[PDB]
Symmetry: none
Subunit: 143 residues, 8 copies
C-alpha cells in the first residue's frame, strides 16, 4: 500500500560464501529498491549497540560473536510494504522452519548462522536504519 | 597468479534498472570477493575529481553528466588476477562489440550508458580505489 | 469467580487497520463489559510513563516509538475473572505462538505490532487502569 | 467525494446489550474511520444541552430520560461522504421501516430505543461533534 | 520533609462568589504547586461516588446536594508536607473555629458552605486524587 | 455590552513561578468569570495546532518550544465585553510597552515569556475555546 | 539539568577564514563536549534536504547557495542544557543584534553570513543530528 | 615553499579534556588549513592497522590500548611546508623536552599521553592520510 524502508543485513556467513549478489537479486526481483548500502566489519560495541534489545537474552553473546566474526553488508531497501515483503522473502528466522524459495531456506545453515537480517516492524526499521545511516546518505532514485 | 584489487562502479543506468544484485552475482560466480562497497550519488565535483585525467578531453562534460544523473554503487573486488578477470566479465567497453554473457552485453544500452566501470590496470586500480575508499574502510575476509 | 477490571489497549496497528469494532466484539461475546473507553494519541512522555517499568530495557525506545506512532484506544473491561479471561482471548504475546481464534492470531502482524495489550495481573491492572482513568470516568452499568 | 466527519452515539440500549463492537465493526466495514471515541454517562443537563433544539417538543422528556438511563459511547467517524454513508448503514430511524443489514434493523427494539444516533447533515455534524469533543481531542490517523 | 500530593476542591459557594484566584494565590504563597486542575459540575452520582464512605451517615444527602449545586474546581497540590500544610492554610473545618488568615476564616459562611476541601491524610489523598484524576493527567513541573 | 467568552492561557513561565492564583484573581476582580479550566502539558503537535496561523513566521519554532517547555493552564473566561476586557487587563503583548497594573507589566520577563495569552477577537476566541474545550465541558454558573 | 545533544554547523564563511578552532574552543570552554564532527562540502541537494521545511520561503535559494559555497564543519555537541546553552554562546541570529562575546558578534559579517548554525529545540536537534549522522557514528566519551 | 598535506590526530587524552578547539586554533594561527576532519573511536584493528610499522615493538600494545581508549579527531592539514611546520607547533614527542608554546608543552601529561600526532615526513603523510581518508572526502577551499 504505502512506500516503506527497511534495513537488510547480509550476515558474515553469507558474505564469506559470496552470496551477496544472489541475495540482492532476490530483493530486486521482488520489487524492492536498494537505496543505501555499505560493507562494514562491526566491532563488539557496534554489534552490542545494534542488538541492545536482546542484551538480557541467553543467545546475546553468540549473536554478537557471530555478527563480529566477519564483514557484513548493511542496506536500506525501499518499496511498497517493504518491511513485511522483505520478511516474506527472508522466510522464518529458523531455516528448518522456513518456506522453500526464501533466503533462510536457500542460504542459511542454522538458527545462529541464518544468512540475513531484516527489520521486524516499521518502528524497528526506523531505529535500525538510523543506527547505520544518516538520512543524508540515503540515495533516492532520480533518473 | 597473485591476489589483486580492482574498483567496480555500477553506473546510474544499471542502478536505476535494479541490476545491482545480478551484476554482483556475476563477480562472485567468477571468484571475485567484494571487500568494500557503498552506494553514493556523486556531485559534479566528485565525478570531475574521479575523471580528472580526462578534464581536457571533449567527452568529459557528457561523462560527468551521466555519472551524476543518479546513484552509483562503488566497490572494491579482490581476487587472483582481479583486474583482468573483472575486465573479462565486464566485456568490451562498447556493448555492441561485447561477448555474450558479459555485463556490457546483457545490461548496457549504448557506449555512454554501459552499465559498469572496471579499473584498466593495477596502477589505475590503486588510484581509483584510493579515490573512493580509505584503507581503513576496506574489509578483508576474516571468517 | 469474582468480578474484576482490566485494562485493554488497541494498539496503533489495529487502529490504523480499523479493527476496533471486531476486537471489541470478541471481548463482549466472551462476557466482558466495556465500562470505560477513549481514543488517545499518546505523547512520548505519556507512553514512557505507562511503560516506566521497562525504562532500562533495550527495546524501550522501539516500544515507545510504536505506541506513539498513531492513536490508540484505551478501555476498562469488567467481568468474572476479567484479567485472565481477557488474556485468554488476546492469546500469546507472540502471534506465531497464539491459539486460533485469539486477537493476536487474527490481527497481529508480528511480536512488536501485536494488535493489543491486556493487563497481566490484578495488581498490574489496578495500576494500569489508574494511569489512564480517574475512578469518576468509569461508567458502571445501570439500565 | 470529499472527506467528512459525523457524530455517532451508541445509545444506552445497545451499550447495555453489549453491541458496541458489532456496531463499530459495521462502521469500519463500510470504510468509516473512528477518529475519536469516549464512553460517558450523560446527566440530565448534558442530554438536554445536546437535544436543546427539541426542548419544546412533546417527546423531549422521554428522549432525555432514555439517553440518561445508562452509559453511551460517543464517537467521531471520518470518511468520504461520511454523513450520508453513516446514515445509510444506520438505516431508517424507525426500525420496523429499516432496510435489512442496517443497525436499526439488527439492533433496535423500537423507535424510542433505536440503538444509535447519527448526525443528519454536515452542519448538524459540526455542531454535534463540537458539543462532545474539543478539536484537540480528535485523533487524525498518522500511521 | 518529603514531597506529597493532596486534593483541593474549591466548593460551589467559593466558585459562585469568584474566589478561585484568591484561594489559589494562598496555596501558591505557602509554597504549594498546582500540578493538576479542572473545573467540573458534579452530577449526583459523581458526588455520591466521591463521598461513598459516608453513604450511611445522616449528613450524606445534604453534602451531595450542596456539592452538586454548582461547579467546583478540583486540583492536585504538590509540595513538602503538602497534606498538613494545605490543612493549615484551610484552617478548621468549622469557620467560626478557624484561625485568622485561613481560607475558612476569610471565605466560608458556615460549616456546610465552608469554601474548600482538603485531603485529611496521605492515604485519603491517594484515594481522592485517583477519584478525579488519571495519573497521566497530572503535570509535573519540568521548568 | 453583550456577554462573551474568551480563552486564557497561563503560560509555562507564570505556572513555573506559581502565579496562577494571582493572575486568576485579577480576572475575577475585573468581573470576568472562570467557566472552564484545566492544566495541560502541550505536546509539539498540540501547540503547533493551536498556533497554526503563525506556521510560516520566523518566531514559530521558539513559540512552540516555549509553550511546550512546561505545563500551562487553559481557561474560558465569561463576561461583558470579555475579549477586550481580558486584553486590557493582560496589557500590551510586549511587557516593556505594557501599562502598570497589567499582567504583562507585573509577571512577564520578556516578549517571548510574557506570562499569559488572551484571544485577540471574538472569532479567534470561538476557534481557540473549541480547540481546547468541548461545549459540554463548559460549566455555566447555576448558583 | 538533563544531558542533551544539539547540531552545530560552522558555516562556509567561518571555515574560509579559518575560525574553526576558535569557535570550537568557545563551545568547550562553556562545558559542551564534541561527540561527533566532520568536514563536508554540501551539494545543492544535501542543503535543500537539510532546510526542507523552508522550501517555500523567499530566503530558501539564498540560504542554499550560501551553505553550498564552500566546505562546512558539522558537529554534535553534548552537555547539560546543550540546546539552549549552544544558542546562548552563538548569540542572536542577526549579528548586529547579538550579545558581545558570542559567535555571531565576533565572527559573523551579516545575517546571511552568520558564521554558525545551532539547533533551535530538542525536537529540531534530533532531526538535524539524524540528517548528518548515523547513531553508530556518534562517539560517546569513555576514558 | 610548496603546499603540502599532513595528518593530525588529536589523541584521546586531549579529546577527553576538551582541548580540540584550542589545538585546532594553534594550527590555524600558524597558517595551516583544515581540509578534512572527523571524530572516530578506533577499534583494535583500526589502530593496529594505522600503527602497523611498530607491530613488532615492545610499546605496540600500550600504544594501541591508549589510542583505542576514547574517541580521537583525525584531520588533514594543508599549507606551505605543512609537514615540518605542523611538527614545529607540536613540539618534541616527549613533553618534558618540548619547547614552550608547543602543543606537547601545553597539553601533554606524559610521553604516552602526549595530546597529538603529526606525520613525520611527506611519505608517511601520504600513507597516513590515505589510511583515514578517501581522496573524495578531502575538501579543498573554494570561496
Ligand atoms: Mg523489534
Ligand atoms: Mg545527500
Ligand atoms: Mg578498519
Ligand atoms: Mg508483569
Ligand atoms: Mg462519574
Ligand atoms: Mg491533540
Ligand atoms: Mg447540616
Ligand atoms: Mg501525561
Ligand atoms: Mg486572530
Ligand atoms: Mg455538561
Ligand atoms: Mg556506538
Ligand atoms: Mg568529494
Amino acid at each position: 500500500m504505502a512506500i516503506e524502508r527497511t534495513l537488510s543485513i547480509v550476515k558474515p556467513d553469507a558474505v564469506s560464501k559470496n552470496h551477496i549478489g544472489e541475495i540482492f537479486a532476490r530483493f530486486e526481483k521482488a520489487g524492492l529498491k536498494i537505496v543505501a548500502t555499505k560493507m562494514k566489519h562491526l566491532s563488539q560495541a557496534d554489534a552490542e549497540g545494534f542488538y541492545a534489545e536482546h542484551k538480557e537474552r541467553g543467545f546475546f553473546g553468540d549473536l554478537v560473536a557471530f555478527m563480529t566474526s566477519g564483514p557484513v553488508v548493511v542496506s536500506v531497501l525501499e518499496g511498497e510494504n517493504a518491511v513485511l515483503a522483505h520478511r516474506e522473502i527472508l522466510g522464518a528466522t529458523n531455516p528448518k522452519e522456513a518456506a522453500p524459495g526464501t533466503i533462510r531456506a536457500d542460504f542459511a545453515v542454522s538458527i545462529d548462522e541464518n544468512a540475513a537480517h531484516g527489520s521486524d516492524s516499521v518502528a524497528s526499521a526506523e531505529r535500525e536504519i538510523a543506527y547505520f545511516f544518516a538520512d543524508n546518505e540515503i540515495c533516492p532514485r532520480t533518473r
